[PDB]
Design a protein around this nucleic acid. Structure first.
Lengths: 87, 227, 193, 12, 67
RNA sequence: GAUGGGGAAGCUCCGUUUCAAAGGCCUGAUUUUAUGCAGGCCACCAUCGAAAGGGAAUCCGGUUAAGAUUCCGGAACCUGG
RNA sequence: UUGACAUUGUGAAGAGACAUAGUUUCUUUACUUAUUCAAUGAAGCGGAGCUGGAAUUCAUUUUCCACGUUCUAGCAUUCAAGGUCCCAUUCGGGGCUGAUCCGGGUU
C-alpha cells in the first residue's frame, strides 16, 4: 500500500512557517502581525527542528497550522479588505 | 585586516559563471504588450496623411494650464447638488414662487459630440477643445476643418481623460465654452487671443507635410555610416 | 507510392543515440573559444561512423552540458576540443569557415550559419576548402560528389575526416548480412522489381 | 450540520 | 450630430486618410485570434443603424474568414 | 490522447511541447509620510498504456465434505509516525 | 511551365507627356514597415562612440580582434571577496566600484 513520502506527516504537518502562513492568509506581513495579536496566536518551538524544516537548521517561526485554519475565518480580515477598497 | 584576503573573479569568456545582469532588453513580453508597442512603432515609421498628424500640435504646457484654470470654474453640477436644487425648487414651486425660475441661470461646459457639432453651425460655441487621442480617430478627424469653416476658435488638447475630469466622466473627446459669467469675459477674451497667436499661427505648415518617415535605430546608423 | 502515409515505413529509433549536432552558436562560440573534454566514443545503431560524447561547461549557470559530435578519425578519449572563432588548427576543433586557409579539409560543415551541420557527414568523407572571397565574405568548397559550392564564411565545420573509412570494401556475401544491416534503418529489404 | 461548501468553524 | 459627417467620410474608401487607416488596422487585427471580442464598435455610425445601442447586453465580436 | 493554436459549410480534422501572462519557494520594524505590499530566486510539462518488463516486506507445522504462502500455533520482516 | 489582376509601400537616377513655372508613364539602382524562412528555456545586437593599444599617419583618422581562458581525463555554485563612504556600532546593514555609456529592433 503506497509507500508514503517521508516528509509529509507529523512535525512537518503540525507546524507552518511564517512565510507559508502569510502566503496562505493572503494579506500582508503587517496585517498578519496585527491579526496574530488580536487573537492572539503565538509562535511555537518544535521538538524536531530538523524534522519540521525538512532538512535544515535555520532560525524560523512556526505557528500551529490549526490555529491558522481557525484564524482564516475571522470577520476582522474582511473589514481590513473593505478598508483597503475604501482607501 | 589579516584574515581577509582578495580573491577577484575573472568573468572572462572561458572561466566563470557570468554574474546577474539587467537583461530587460531581451524579455519575451506577452502578446498584448508586444502588439501595443509594435503598433506605436509601425505608426512612427510610416508616412501619414496630412489630416492625421494635424494633431500632435497641441497647447503647450503653460497655455494648457492656463486654459484649464478657467475651464475648471465651470464644472457641470453633480448628483448631490442636483438633488439639492431639486429640493429647493420643490419647496418654492408652491410656497413662494417658482416656474423653474427661482434658481438663476446655470453656466457649465458642453461636452457631447453630437451636441457640440450641432452647437457649431448655430453658431454659439466660443471655444472648442478637441482631445487629440481618440482611438477611432475618424470621429474627430473632421472637426478642425468645420471649425475653421464656420469661424470658431478651436484648439486641440493633449488627453481625453484630462477633458473628462472637468465634465465628471472618464473620457469626453470634446468640450465647448458657449457662455461665460460676467467676471470671466476678459479671461476668455485674452485666452482666445492666446490660442490665436499660438495655435493658429505657429502651424501654417501643418496643412502640408505628411509626417512619419522616420527610420529605426540600426537602419539610421547604417545609412549614416554609409553616407 | 505506399511509403508516404507511413504505417510501416518509418524509422527504427529505439537504440539510436540522438541527433548528432554541434553546439548552439552563442556568445563565446562567436567571440572567443571554449573547451570541452571527449569522454566516450560509442557505436550508434544505423550509422557507419562512431559518435563522440563531448562535455562542455555552461557559461551562464553552474551546470554541465553534454553534446554529441561525429568523431573525426584520430580523436581519443581524454582530448580537449576547442570551439569558437579563436580555435587553433588541430584535428577535432570546430572553426568558422573564414578562418581556415585554402587547401584545408573540414567535415560536418554547416550550410547556413547556425543550422548545425549538413555536408560531409557519412563515414570517410571530407570537404576541401578551395578559396575565400573576403570582400562580400564568401567561401568556395568542394563537396564529395564533386560539386563546387559557395557558402557563407561564418558557417562552422570540424577539422578532419569522418572515421570508419572503408566500410564498402568487404562484400556482404549473404542475404543474412543484408537482413541484419537493414533491420535497423527502415523497412526497405527485400525489394521487388 | 453543513449545508454549504464553506463554513465558519464556530469552535476554537 | 456628427454621424452625417462620419457616414459620408466612410464612403470615400480610397482616399488617403482612409486607405492609410485600412493598412494600420488590417495589420493590427492579423495578430489577434481568428475570433475575438471587440471592446467597442469601430463604426459606431454603421452599428447604430443596424440595431446597436450603447447599453448593457449589446456585444460586438470580430471574426476573420478565409477568401 | 486533452489544453494553447490552426484548418472545415459541418459531422469534426491536425499536433504533444508546440508561436501561450501554462506556478511555487525565501526574506521582511523594506522605514519613514504612520489602517492600501516590498525585495528576490528557479524553470518543464496534463493524461492513458504490461496480472510474461521494472518493483519494500513471510516461513514451517496442523486444519475441512469442499478454503489456505489467507484460517489456527509458533517464529519473523517492510513502510510511515 | 508561362501571362494577367490583388495583397503592394519609401526613394534616386535616366528618358517621355503638362504646351523654361511640377503633376503623370517605361527603365535601372537603393530602402524596410508589409509578407516569407530558421534559432534561442528571446544572454551580451547596432555602428558608434569612449578610455587601452598597436598600426600608418600626408593633416587627421580610417579597416582588424575587443586583448583576462591551449603541455595535463583536477576544481569553479549561496546578492562575490577586496577598495572606499555613511550609519548608530551589536549580533551588522546600507552606497559607488569591482563589471564604461547610449538605443521607441530577441537574433
Amino acid at each position: 500500500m503506497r509507500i508514503k513520502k517521508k516528509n509529509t506527516r507529523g512535525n512537518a504537518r503540525n507546524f507552518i512557517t511564517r512565510s507559508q502562513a502569510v502566503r496562505k492568509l493572503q494579506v500582508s506581513l503587517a496585517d498578519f502581525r496585527r491579526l496574530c495579536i488580536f487573537k492572539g496566536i503565538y509562535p511555537r518551538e518544535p521538538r524536531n527542528k530538523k524534522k519540521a524544516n525538512k532538512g535544515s537548521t535555520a532560525p524560523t517561526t512556526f505557528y500551529y497550522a490549526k490555529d491558522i485554519q481557525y484564524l482564516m475565518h475571522e470577520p476582522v480580515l474582511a473589514k481590513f479588505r473593505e478598508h483597503k477598497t475604501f482607501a | 585586516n589579516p584574515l581577509t584576503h582578495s580573491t577577484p573573479k575573472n568573468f572572462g569568456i572561458g572561466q566563470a559563471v557570468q554574474p546577474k545582469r539587467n537583461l530587460s532588453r531581451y524579455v519575451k513580453w506577452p502578446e498584448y504588450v508586444r502588439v501595443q508597442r509594435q503598433k506605436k512603432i509601425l505608426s512612427i515609421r510610416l508616412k501619414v496623411p496630412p489630416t492625421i498628424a494635424q494633431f500632435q500640435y497641441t497647447l503647450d504646457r503653460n497655455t494648457a494650464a492656463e486654459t484649464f484654470k478657467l475651464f475648471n470654474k465651470y464644472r457641470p453640477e453633480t448628483a448631490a447638488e442636483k438633488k439639492e436644487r431639486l429640493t429647493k425648487e420643490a419647496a418654492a414651486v408652491a410656497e413662494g414662487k417658482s416656474k423653474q425660475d427661482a434658481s438663476p441661470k446655470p453656466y457649465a461646459v458642453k461636452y457631447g459630440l453630437n451636441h457640440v457639432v450641432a452647437l457649431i453651425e448655430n453658431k454659439k460655441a466660443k471655444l472648442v477643445l478637441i482631445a487629440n487621442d481618440v482611438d477611432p480617430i475618424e470621429l474627430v478627424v473632421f472637426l478642425p476643418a468645420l471649425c475653421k469653416k464656420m469661424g470658431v476658435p478651436y484648439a486641440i488638447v493633449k488627453g481625453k481623460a484630462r477633458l473628462g475630469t472637468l465634465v465628471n466622466q472618464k473620457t469626453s473627446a470634446v468640450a465647448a465654452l458657449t457662455e461665460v459669467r460676467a467676471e470671466d469675459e476678459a479671461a476668455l477674451a485674452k485666452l482666445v487671443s492666446t490660442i490665436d497667436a499660438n495655435f493658429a499661427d505657429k502651424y501654417d505648415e501643418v496643412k502640408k507635410h505628411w509626417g512619419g518617415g522616420i527610420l529605426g535605430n540600426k537602419a539610421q546608423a547604417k545609412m549614416d555610416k554609409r553616407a | 507510392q505506399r511509403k508516404g502515409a507511413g504505417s510501416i515505413f518509418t524509422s527504427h529509433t529505439r537504440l539510436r543515440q540522438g541527433a548528432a549536432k554541434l553546439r548552439t552558436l552563442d556568445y563565446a562560440e562567436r567571440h572567443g573559444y571554449i573547451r570541452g573534454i571527449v569522454k566516450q566514443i560509442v557505436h550508434d545503431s544505423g550509422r557507419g561512423a562512431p559518435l563522440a560524447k563531448v562535455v562542455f561547461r555552461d557559461p551562464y549557470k553552474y551546470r554541465l552540458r553534454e553534446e554529441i559530435f561525429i568523431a573525426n578519425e584520430g580523436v581519443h578519449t581524454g582530448q580537449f576540443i576547442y570551439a569558437g572563432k579563436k580555435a587553433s588548427l588541430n584535428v577535432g576543433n570546430v572553426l568558422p569557415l573564414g578562418s581556415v586557409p585554402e587547401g584545408t579539409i573540414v567535415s560536418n560543415v554547416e550550410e547556413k550559419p547556425g543550422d548545425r551541420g549538413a555536408l560531409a557527414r557519412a563515414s570517410g568523407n571530407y570537404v576541401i576548402i578551395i578559396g575565400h572571397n573576403p570582400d562580400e565574405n564568401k567561401t568556395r568548397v568542394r563537396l564529395p560528389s564533386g560539386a563546387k559550392k559557395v557558402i557563407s564564411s561564418d558557417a562552422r565545420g570540424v577539422i578532419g575526416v569522418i572515421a570508419g573509412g572503408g566500410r564498402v570494401d568487404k562484400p556482404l556475401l549473404k542475404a543474412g548480412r543484408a537482413f541484419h544491416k537493414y533491420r535497423l534503418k527502415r523497412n526497405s529489404w527485400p525489394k521487388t522489381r | 450540520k453543513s449545508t454549504t461548501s464553506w463554513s465558519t468553524a464556530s469552535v476554537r | 450630430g456628427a454621424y452625417k459627417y462620419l457616414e459620408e467620410l466612410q464612403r470615400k474608401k480610397q482616399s488617403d486618410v482612409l486607405r492609410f487607416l485600412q493598412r494600420v488596422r488590417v495589420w493590427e487585427y492579423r495578430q489577434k485570434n481568428v475570433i475575438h471580442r471587440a471592446a467597442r464598435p469601430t463604426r459606431p455610425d454603421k452599428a447604430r443603424r443596424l440595431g446597436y445601442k450603447a447599453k448593457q447586453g449589446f456585444v460586438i465580436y470580430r471574426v476573420r474568414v478565409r477568401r
